Structure formats: structure tokens, C-alpha cells
Design a protein around this nucleic acid. Structure first.
Length: 288
DNA sequence: GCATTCATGTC
DNA sequence: GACAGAAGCC
């Protein structure tokens, strides 16, 4: 773990912030050879247009900042790399504004953030591949895919970039199925990879979120759930709620996928942060 | 092997 | 809102 570049950068963040949990979360989904997560370490390959390189992020709890290191090939697009790190880490969040608006739901784990992404397509691939399988199973699968269609780095051979919309769209649906997924899933990927090149998949948080999710569910392999959990991680939409998630219903013993949609109305417009708390806050029981 | 969640797709 | 392919237990 030597420095991978000579340039370093500093990103300020608003306390509190549970880094233990963030990097915890990101390490369980870490795609082997694409990214490496450790104690207070996060590194990963990164493409920014034509430019390729390695980015590492190390939190500094005391000075409340995040230290960033960049491969020499990412220098010219540093500003945009820093925006990806920001979006991946949810740095611009105002915990007080959110946590106040969550009330009791926020009290236990105020350091929770919205784990984002570095790329809207990559997230799209993920949301699908991790659809019906365990968190861990989904990461091995994605490793194998990247292994196949991922481009290696000329300056850092250990790392490969997540496969682009190009070499993914133009992939033998049968080659993908042979990596450990149904055929109808190898096709969702391809239909996505496709939507990417023809600007049919919004690569940034669009104006009308709800409207852009309707449009998504019309894709193959993508339903209400897969399209919500994408808006959350892919666009970092902060006002999204999945009343249909298996774990949430269990938290609302005796309540319909419609009697909670109006319960989680009370957390507008921070419903994504509300959802997370609900998951990772164990002893939380709804106000009956 | 029949059963059960779990999520997409249809009527 | 209400039914009709894929990935645990007797």
C-alpha cells in the first residue's frame, strides 16, 4: 500500500460520519481486482472520459476530511474524480438537516450516509447482477464479469476498470450466462449497456426522479425494486423509498406495501436516508 | 423433491 | 391492487 500518485487532495465533510460503517458496507460489495477496501482505506480503478488511473480515499476523522491520492493519468481530470469520490461517499450531506427531519429514526446511527457510486452504468450492472443473490455471491459474479470484459491498467496491472458500455453491450449473452447467471439476466445487462451508448440511461440524477424510474421499469430484468435501489445508489436520489423491500415489511408487522408508503410520507424529502436507518438500525420499531 | 420466499411481468 | 421464473427443510 504505497502511494499510487504524487498528487494528493483534501475533501472536507460535515460531522458526524460513521466511516467504520461506510467502508464496512463498501468492502462487502468490493469487486475483486477493481477495488480494494480495508480499515480506513478505499482504492479503486477509475475512468474519466479518455483518462485512466487509480484513486485512493483515506478518511481523517479528527480533521474531519478525506484524503485523496491520484494516479498520474487522472491529474487532468482531478476535479471530476473528486466529484465521483464525493458522490460515492456522500460528502455534501448535511447530517443535521437530515437527522432532525428523521427524528427518532436517526437518533441511533446519525453517522449513516448514502453509499453512492463512481459511475451510473457500473451501478446499473450491479443492481441487476446482485438481484436475487446474496451480497457476497453478487460480488464474486461481478468479479468474473470484470475479469472477462474489464480493461487492465497500463500503469497498474493489478487493477482493471469496470467494463464499459461498449464491450459489455457487444457481449455474447451465452458467455455471460456461463459465468453464473440466468439468460434473461445476461440480457438485462446487454439491454442496459445498450441504453448507455444511446443516451437512453441517464448518467446523472435527472430532473424528475419518479418519472425516470417509470421509464426504467420498462426495461427487461428491471422492476420497481431494482429500479428504486438503483436511483438510490446510482443517482444518489435522497428521496426514495422501497415499501416493497422484504426487510421493510418485516419491520412493519401487519401492514401493506401501501400502508407504509403513506407512513414513510412523514420523512419527505429524506426518504432514502430514512430507508437506510431502518435497515441498519436493529432495535427500531415503527410508531404504531 | 415439494415448499417457500423474492422479484418481475400481466391482466 | 390481485394473481401468475428463480434461488429451504421433512
Amino acid at each position: 500500500m504505497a502511494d499510487i500518485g504524487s498528487e494528493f487532495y483534501t475533501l472536507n465533510w460535515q460531522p458526524p460520519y460513521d466511516w467504520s460503517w461506510m467502508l464496512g458496507f463498501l468492502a462487502a460489495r468490493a469487486v475483486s481486482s477493481v477495488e480494494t477496501v480495508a480499515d480506513s482505506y478505499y482504492a479503486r480503478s477509475l475512468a474519466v472520459g479518455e483518462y485512466r488511473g487509480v484513486v485512493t480515499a483515506i478518511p481523517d476523522i479528527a480533521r474531519h476530511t478525506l484524503h485523496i491520492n491520484l494516479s498520474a493519468g487522472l491529474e487532468p481530470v482531478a476535479a471530476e474524480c473528486l466529484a465521483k469520490m464525493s458522490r460515492l461517499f456522500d460528502l455534501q450531506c448535511n447530517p443535521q438537516i437530515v437527522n432532525g427531519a428523521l427524528g427518532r429514526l436517526g437518533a441511533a446511527r446519525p453517522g449513516l450516509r448514502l453509499p453512492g457510486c463512481v459511475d451510473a452504468f457500473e451501478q446499473g450492472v450491479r443492481a441487476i447482477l446482485g438481484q436475487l443473490v446474496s451480497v457476497a455471491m453478487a460480488a464474486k459474479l461481478t468479479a468474473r464479469v470484470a475479469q472477462l470484459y474489464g480493461e487492465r491498467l497500463d500503469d497498474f496491472p493489478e487493477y482493471i476498470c469496470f467494463p464499459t458500455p461498449q464491450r459489455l453491450a457487444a457481449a455474447d449473452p451465452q458467455a455471460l450466462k456461463a459465468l453464473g447467471m440466468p439468460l434473461k439476466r445476461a440480457e438485462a445487462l446487454i439491454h442496459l449497456a445498450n441504453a448507455a451508448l444511446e443516451g437512453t440511461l441517464p448518467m446523472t440524477i435527472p430532473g424528475d426522479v419518479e418519472q425516470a424510474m417509470k421509464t426504467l421499469q420498462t426495461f427487461p430484468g428491471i422492476g420497481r425494486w431494482t429500479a428504486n435501489y438503483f436511483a438510490l445508489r446510482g443517482w444518489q436520489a435522497k428521496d426514495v423509498f422501497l415499501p416493497d423491500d422484504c426487510l421493510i415489511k418485516q419491520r412493519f408487522p401487519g401492514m401493506t406495501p401501501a400502508q407504509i408508503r403513506r407512513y414513510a410520507e412523514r420523512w419527505k424529502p429524506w426518504r432514502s436516508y430514512a430507508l437506510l436507518h431502518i435497515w441498519y438500525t436493529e432495535g427500531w420499531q415503527p410508531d404504531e
